[PDB]
Design a protein around this ligand. Structure first.
Ligand SMILES: [Fe+3]
Length: 310
Protein backbone atom coordinates (compact mmCIF):
# COMPACT_ATOMS: atom_id res chain seq x y z
CA UNK A 1 0.00 0.00 0.00
CA UNK A 2 1.23 3.49 -0.97
CA UNK A 3 1.90 6.04 1.81
CA UNK A 4 -0.65 8.83 1.87
CA UNK A 5 0.44 12.11 0.34
CA UNK A 6 -1.34 15.45 -0.15
CA UNK A 7 -2.99 15.97 -3.51
CA UNK A 8 -3.93 19.63 -2.98
CA UNK A 9 -1.95 22.48 -1.49
CA UNK A 10 -4.55 22.85 1.26
CA UNK A 11 -3.98 19.22 2.31
CA UNK A 12 -0.57 20.30 3.61
CA UNK A 13 -2.66 21.34 6.65
CA UNK A 14 -3.13 17.65 7.47
CA UNK A 15 0.33 16.73 8.75
CA UNK A 16 1.79 20.24 9.12
CA UNK A 17 1.37 19.90 12.90
CA UNK A 18 2.86 16.39 13.16
CA UNK A 19 6.11 17.65 14.56
CA UNK A 20 8.36 16.34 17.27
CA UNK A 21 6.28 17.91 20.07
CA UNK A 22 9.09 17.83 22.67
CA UNK A 23 11.47 20.25 21.03
CA UNK A 24 15.16 21.03 21.17
CA UNK A 25 14.72 23.91 23.63
CA UNK A 26 13.81 21.36 26.32
CA UNK A 27 17.26 19.72 26.18
CA UNK A 28 19.62 20.43 29.06
CA UNK A 29 22.43 21.41 26.68
CA UNK A 30 20.32 23.83 24.64
CA UNK A 31 21.67 27.41 24.88
CA UNK A 32 18.21 28.51 26.07
CA UNK A 33 17.44 25.62 28.43
CA UNK A 34 17.65 27.62 31.68
CA UNK A 35 15.82 30.67 30.26
CA UNK A 36 12.07 30.41 31.01
CA UNK A 37 11.32 33.52 28.92
CA UNK A 38 12.95 31.82 25.94
CA UNK A 39 11.00 28.63 26.66
CA UNK A 40 7.69 30.52 26.63
CA UNK A 41 8.72 32.43 23.52
CA UNK A 42 9.37 29.14 21.73
CA UNK A 43 5.93 27.89 22.78
CA UNK A 44 4.40 31.12 21.48
CA UNK A 45 5.94 30.57 18.04
CA UNK A 46 4.87 26.92 18.07
CA UNK A 47 1.28 27.98 18.76
CA UNK A 48 1.33 30.35 15.78
CA UNK A 49 2.42 27.48 13.54
CA UNK A 50 -0.10 25.08 15.08
CA UNK A 51 -3.00 27.45 14.39
CA UNK A 52 -1.84 28.41 10.90
CA UNK A 53 -3.92 27.18 7.95
CA UNK A 54 -3.03 27.37 4.26
CA UNK A 55 -4.16 30.55 2.55
CA UNK A 56 -3.99 32.67 5.72
CA UNK A 57 -1.50 35.51 6.11
CA UNK A 58 1.37 34.44 8.32
CA UNK A 59 0.92 36.29 11.64
CA UNK A 60 3.39 39.11 12.23
CA UNK A 61 5.37 39.08 15.47
CA UNK A 62 6.92 42.01 17.32
CA UNK A 63 10.45 40.76 17.93
CA UNK A 64 12.12 41.75 21.17
CA UNK A 65 15.23 43.94 21.31
CA UNK A 66 17.30 40.94 22.43
CA UNK A 67 16.10 38.91 19.42
CA UNK A 68 16.87 41.76 17.02
CA UNK A 69 20.37 42.03 18.51
CA UNK A 70 20.94 38.32 17.92
CA UNK A 71 19.69 38.60 14.35
CA UNK A 72 21.91 41.64 13.77
CA UNK A 73 24.98 39.78 14.98
CA UNK A 74 24.31 36.81 12.69
CA UNK A 75 23.39 39.08 9.76
CA UNK A 76 26.45 41.32 10.01
CA UNK A 77 28.95 38.50 10.46
CA UNK A 78 27.57 36.34 7.63
CA UNK A 79 27.04 39.25 5.24
CA UNK A 80 30.81 39.85 5.11
CA UNK A 81 31.24 36.50 3.28
CA UNK A 82 28.48 36.47 0.70
CA UNK A 83 30.04 38.58 -2.08
CA UNK A 84 33.00 36.20 -2.33
CA UNK A 85 31.57 32.84 -1.15
CA UNK A 86 27.89 32.70 -2.16
CA UNK A 87 26.72 31.81 -5.64
CA UNK A 88 25.60 34.46 -8.13
CA UNK A 89 21.92 33.67 -7.57
CA UNK A 90 22.34 34.53 -3.89
CA UNK A 91 24.14 37.81 -4.51
CA UNK A 92 21.71 38.76 -7.28
CA UNK A 93 18.67 38.67 -4.99
CA UNK A 94 20.14 39.81 -1.67
CA UNK A 95 19.92 43.59 -2.42
CA UNK A 96 16.26 43.12 -3.34
CA UNK A 97 15.64 41.35 -0.02
CA UNK A 98 17.29 44.27 1.77
CA UNK A 99 15.23 46.79 -0.20
CA UNK A 100 11.78 45.15 -0.25
CA UNK A 101 11.78 42.65 2.65
CA UNK A 102 13.59 44.58 5.37
CA UNK A 103 16.72 42.41 5.49
CA UNK A 104 18.80 44.71 7.71
CA UNK A 105 20.85 44.26 10.85
CA UNK A 106 18.32 46.07 13.05
CA UNK A 107 15.17 44.38 11.72
CA UNK A 108 14.01 40.75 11.61
CA UNK A 109 11.95 40.26 8.42
CA UNK A 110 8.36 39.11 8.77
CA UNK A 111 7.54 35.78 7.14
CA UNK A 112 4.43 37.16 5.46
CA UNK A 113 6.52 39.76 3.63
CA UNK A 114 9.17 37.20 2.66
CA UNK A 115 6.52 34.74 1.47
CA UNK A 116 4.90 37.40 -0.75
CA UNK A 117 8.35 38.24 -2.14
CA UNK A 118 9.11 34.60 -2.97
CA UNK A 119 5.68 34.19 -4.54
CA UNK A 120 6.53 37.01 -6.98
CA UNK A 121 9.94 35.46 -7.75
CA UNK A 122 9.08 31.78 -8.29
CA UNK A 123 5.72 31.05 -6.70
CA UNK A 124 7.40 29.60 -3.63
CA UNK A 125 5.57 30.38 -0.41
CA UNK A 126 6.37 29.94 3.27
CA UNK A 127 4.37 28.18 5.92
CA UNK A 128 5.37 28.56 9.60
CA UNK A 129 6.39 25.32 11.26
CA UNK A 130 6.57 24.67 15.00
CA UNK A 131 9.39 22.14 15.06
CA UNK A 132 10.81 19.07 13.33
CA UNK A 133 8.68 17.58 10.57
CA UNK A 134 9.29 14.14 9.14
CA UNK A 135 11.37 14.10 5.97
CA UNK A 136 8.34 12.80 4.10
CA UNK A 137 6.19 15.75 5.18
CA UNK A 138 8.85 18.43 4.72
CA UNK A 139 9.92 17.18 1.29
CA UNK A 140 6.30 16.76 0.20
CA UNK A 141 5.73 20.47 0.73
CA UNK A 142 8.39 21.24 -1.87
CA UNK A 143 6.27 19.52 -4.55
CA UNK A 144 3.83 22.45 -4.10
CA UNK A 145 6.64 25.02 -3.85
CA UNK A 146 5.86 25.33 -0.14
CA UNK A 147 8.78 25.75 2.26
CA UNK A 148 8.01 24.93 5.90
CA UNK A 149 9.82 27.75 7.72
CA UNK A 150 10.67 28.43 11.37
CA UNK A 151 9.74 31.78 12.89
CA UNK A 152 11.66 31.61 16.19
CA UNK A 153 15.26 32.73 16.69
CA UNK A 154 18.19 31.07 18.41
CA UNK A 155 19.01 32.00 22.00
CA UNK A 156 20.97 35.22 22.33
CA UNK A 157 23.71 33.80 24.58
CA UNK A 158 25.32 32.01 21.60
CA UNK A 159 24.53 34.05 18.48
CA UNK A 160 26.96 32.11 16.27
CA UNK A 161 25.59 28.71 17.25
CA UNK A 162 22.31 26.92 16.79
CA UNK A 163 21.56 23.19 17.24
CA UNK A 164 18.51 23.49 14.99
CA UNK A 165 17.02 25.53 12.17
CA UNK A 166 15.97 28.98 13.28
CA UNK A 167 14.77 32.06 11.42
CA UNK A 168 18.33 33.23 10.67
CA UNK A 169 19.04 29.92 8.90
CA UNK A 170 15.74 30.09 7.01
CA UNK A 171 16.06 33.69 5.86
CA UNK A 172 19.79 33.93 5.23
CA UNK A 173 20.34 30.34 4.12
CA UNK A 174 17.24 29.11 2.30
CA UNK A 175 15.15 32.08 1.12
CA UNK A 176 17.61 33.66 -1.37
CA UNK A 177 17.95 30.42 -3.35
CA UNK A 178 14.18 29.83 -3.45
CA UNK A 179 14.02 33.19 -5.29
CA UNK A 180 15.80 31.59 -8.28
CA UNK A 181 13.65 29.83 -10.89
CA UNK A 182 16.11 27.04 -11.67
CA UNK A 183 16.70 26.32 -7.98
CA UNK A 184 12.96 26.38 -7.30
CA UNK A 185 12.41 23.85 -10.09
CA UNK A 186 15.20 21.65 -8.73
CA UNK A 187 13.89 21.64 -5.15
CA UNK A 188 10.37 20.97 -6.38
CA UNK A 189 11.69 17.92 -8.25
CA UNK A 190 12.94 16.48 -4.95
CA UNK A 191 9.50 17.10 -3.49
CA UNK A 192 7.74 15.42 -6.41
CA UNK A 193 10.07 12.41 -6.14
CA UNK A 194 9.06 12.02 -2.50
CA UNK A 195 5.30 11.77 -3.01
CA UNK A 196 4.25 8.25 -2.06
CA UNK A 197 7.83 6.99 -2.08
CA UNK A 198 8.72 4.10 0.25
CA UNK A 199 10.39 5.08 3.52
CA UNK A 200 13.76 3.78 2.32
CA UNK A 201 13.65 6.17 -0.65
CA UNK A 202 12.51 9.09 1.50
CA UNK A 203 15.76 8.65 3.44
CA UNK A 204 17.70 8.58 0.15
CA UNK A 205 15.96 11.77 -0.99
CA UNK A 206 16.67 13.35 2.40
CA UNK A 207 20.36 12.57 1.89
CA UNK A 208 20.28 14.08 -1.60
CA UNK A 209 18.62 17.13 -0.01
CA UNK A 210 21.39 17.31 2.60
CA UNK A 211 24.11 17.34 -0.04
CA UNK A 212 22.36 19.87 -2.28
CA UNK A 213 19.80 22.19 -0.66
CA UNK A 214 21.64 22.19 2.67
CA UNK A 215 25.36 21.70 1.89
CA UNK A 216 25.63 21.95 -1.89
CA UNK A 217 28.38 23.64 -3.86
CA UNK A 218 27.90 24.56 -7.50
CA UNK A 219 30.02 25.34 -10.50
CA UNK A 220 29.92 28.99 -11.55
CA UNK A 221 31.79 29.50 -14.79
CA UNK A 222 35.30 28.32 -13.92
CA UNK A 223 34.79 28.74 -10.16
CA UNK A 224 32.93 26.98 -7.33
CA UNK A 225 30.50 28.71 -4.95
CA UNK A 226 28.20 27.76 -2.07
CA UNK A 227 24.46 27.45 -2.48
CA UNK A 228 23.57 25.13 0.42
CA UNK A 229 21.54 26.83 3.16
CA UNK A 230 23.53 25.15 5.92
CA UNK A 231 26.71 26.63 4.48
CA UNK A 232 25.21 30.06 3.83
CA UNK A 233 24.06 30.34 7.45
CA UNK A 234 27.32 29.03 9.02
CA UNK A 235 30.11 31.61 9.28
CA UNK A 236 32.78 29.00 9.93
CA UNK A 237 31.68 26.36 7.46
CA UNK A 238 31.03 28.81 4.61
CA UNK A 239 34.71 29.75 4.73
CA UNK A 240 35.89 26.15 5.16
CA UNK A 241 33.85 24.65 2.30
CA UNK A 242 35.75 26.62 -0.37
CA UNK A 243 39.18 25.95 1.19
CA UNK A 244 41.60 23.11 0.41
CA UNK A 245 40.52 21.03 3.41
CA UNK A 246 37.30 19.20 2.33
CA UNK A 247 36.98 16.63 -0.42
CA UNK A 248 34.86 17.66 -3.40
CA UNK A 249 33.13 15.19 -5.72
CA UNK A 250 30.76 15.65 -8.66
CA UNK A 251 27.09 15.31 -7.81
CA UNK A 252 26.15 11.73 -8.78
CA UNK A 253 22.92 10.65 -7.18
CA UNK A 254 23.47 6.88 -7.00
CA UNK A 255 26.49 7.68 -4.80
CA UNK A 256 25.22 10.85 -3.12
CA UNK A 257 21.95 9.23 -2.03
CA UNK A 258 23.73 6.62 0.13
CA UNK A 259 26.62 8.74 1.42
CA UNK A 260 26.82 8.98 5.19
CA UNK A 261 27.13 12.27 7.03
CA UNK A 262 26.93 13.72 10.51
CA UNK A 263 25.21 16.93 11.58
CA UNK A 264 27.60 18.02 14.34
CA UNK A 265 30.92 18.91 12.62
CA UNK A 266 31.91 20.50 9.32
CA UNK A 267 31.26 18.20 6.38
CA UNK A 268 34.39 16.32 5.25
CA UNK A 269 32.92 15.91 1.76
CA UNK A 270 30.81 18.10 -0.53
CA UNK A 271 29.14 17.33 -3.86
CA UNK A 272 29.44 19.88 -6.67
CA UNK A 273 26.45 20.50 -8.91
CA UNK A 274 27.10 21.43 -12.55
CA UNK A 275 24.02 23.69 -12.46
CA UNK A 276 20.60 23.61 -10.87
CA UNK A 277 19.10 22.52 -14.20
CA UNK A 278 21.51 19.60 -14.34
CA UNK A 279 20.82 18.64 -10.73
CA UNK A 280 17.09 18.78 -11.50
CA UNK A 281 17.48 16.39 -14.43
CA UNK A 282 19.52 14.06 -12.22
CA UNK A 283 16.76 14.07 -9.58
CA UNK A 284 14.17 13.34 -12.28
CA UNK A 285 16.25 10.38 -13.47
CA UNK A 286 16.70 9.15 -9.89
CA UNK A 287 12.95 9.48 -9.26
CA UNK A 288 12.30 7.08 -12.15
CA UNK A 289 14.05 4.38 -10.08
CA UNK A 290 11.74 4.85 -7.05
CA UNK A 291 9.17 2.02 -6.96
CA UNK A 292 5.87 3.84 -7.25
CA UNK A 293 2.88 2.46 -9.19
CA UNK A 294 2.16 5.93 -10.56
CA UNK A 295 3.70 9.17 -11.75
CA UNK A 296 3.00 12.65 -10.38
CA UNK A 297 3.10 16.22 -11.61
CA UNK A 298 2.12 19.53 -10.04
CA UNK A 299 -0.47 21.66 -11.78
CA UNK A 300 0.25 25.23 -10.63
CA UNK A 301 -2.98 26.46 -12.23
CA UNK A 302 -5.13 24.49 -9.77
CA UNK A 303 -2.49 23.81 -7.09
CA UNK A 304 -3.18 20.07 -7.25
CA UNK A 305 -1.02 17.01 -7.85
CA UNK A 306 -2.04 15.04 -10.93
CA UNK A 307 -1.53 11.31 -10.34
CA UNK A 308 -1.32 9.10 -13.45
CA UNK A 309 -0.86 5.33 -13.13
CA UNK A 310 2.19 3.85 -14.92
FE1 LIG B 1 17.60 24.09 6.38
Amino acid sequence: TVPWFPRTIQELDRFANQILSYGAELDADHPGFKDPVYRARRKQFADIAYNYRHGQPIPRVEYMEEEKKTWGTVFKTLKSLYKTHACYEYNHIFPLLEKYCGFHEDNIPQLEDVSQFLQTCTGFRLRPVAGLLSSRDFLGGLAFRVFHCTQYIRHGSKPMYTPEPDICHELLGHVPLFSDRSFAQFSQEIGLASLGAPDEYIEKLATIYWFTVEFGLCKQGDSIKAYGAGLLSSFGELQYCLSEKPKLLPLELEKTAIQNYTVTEFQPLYYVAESFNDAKEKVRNFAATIPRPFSVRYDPYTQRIEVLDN
